[PDB]
Structures are given as structure tokens and as C-alpha cells.
């Protein structure tokens with residue numbers, strides 16, 4: 659298939675109260691398709707780092723890979739990790755970019 | 764090519780808005796969220812993640828996303844039924860909030 663980039667971002671959480679990422683995921687009768695960055699919030703660690711983008715797929719947190727768990731379980735892990743101190747390592751597939759919110763109609 | 768295209772005709776007499784948010788890539792435009800009790804919510808067929816291909820006689824496949832959105836707003840503002848043609852996502856998108 660067409661080449662996709664992956665990046666690993668190490669976040670110093672000392673000066674932040676949040677990653678500042680929303681998470682969206684698709685789950686239906688056909689399976690779970692993984693979890694993605696929905697949007698980013700200025701003021702959080704991920705914005706300050708400046709590499710991750712809406713639409714990127716979150717593959718792994720620290721050494722915990724999500725590709726063989728449910729979206730719900732992946733989110734449980736992310737939840738656990740953000741409530742503990744110290745650096746957070748996020749690895750994303752660069753599936754994102756090019757997204758625009760047009761608002762309500 | 765599209766898998767599962769549906770035609771959704773909305774009666775816009777009972778409603779003011781479609782009650783959908785739109786996000787575009789580019790790529791094309793997609794349903795971001797659906798607001799309870801709006802035309803689209805009342806209708807029930809369209810789901811978050813579906814791709815919006817056409818409205819009435821205006822096909823978006825040869826149009827920029829910004830132009831598509833402006834066409835759509837113009838049409839919602841004017842009286843008349845609205846026919847949306849969507850390519851289905853399969854549904855099941857979930858918002859998990861913030862971290």
C-alpha cells in the first residue's frame with residue numbers, strides 16, 4: 659500500500675495539565691477500527707510539541723500497543739496513563755492532516 | 764465508485780436547520796455530528812462519518828469543500844425540500860472526549 663509515516667512524540671508533562679487531544683474511534687458489527695486524534699486543544703502538551711494532527715491514528719502509548727485491543731480498552735489505557743505523573747510517549751500513524759471544521763448547518 | 768449510496772429526502776417545513784456539523788478533508792465533506800431533534804436526526808438514516816456527495820442538483824465531486832459548504836448553506840437558507848445523497852460509513856463512530 660501507499661507509504662504512511664509514523665512519529666513518536668515524548669511529552670514532558672511537568673508544565674501541562676492535559677495532553678489536549680480528543681479521541682474518536684469507530685466500532686460496529688465489522689469490528690473496531692482504532693482510535694484517532696479528533697482535535698487538539700491549545701494550551702496542552704500535544705499542541706506545544708507541534709507534531710501530532712487531527713486525524714492521526716494513535717497506535718501506542720509508551721510501550722503499550724493498541725492494535726490488538728478494542729477502542730474502549732485502548733481509551734482505558736490512555737485514561738490510566740494521563741492520571742499518572744511523568745513523561746508520556748505517543749506514537750501515531752500520520753493518517754491525519756487536511757481536516758477542517760465547517761460548523762453547524 | 765461508492766459502496767452504499769443513499770438518497771435522503773428531507774421535508775424542511777417542520778425544521779429550521781439540517782442539524783448536522785460538517786468536516787471536510789482536502790477528499791470531500793463528511794457528517795461530523797448530528798443534533799437530536801433536527802431534520803437529519805428526525806429522519807434517522809444519516810450517521811456521523813457518512814460522506815455528503817450531492818445536494819439537490821449540486822454534485823460536490825467536482826467542487827472544492829469550501830464551495831460545497833457554501834452551496835449547502837445557501838440551499839438550507841432557501842425554502843424547499845432538501846435531498847441529500849450520502850455514501851454510508853457503516854456508523855459506530857464514538858466520541859471519547861478529552862485527555
Ligand SMILES: [Cl-]
Nearest residue numbers: 664665666667
Ligand atoms: Cl519520530
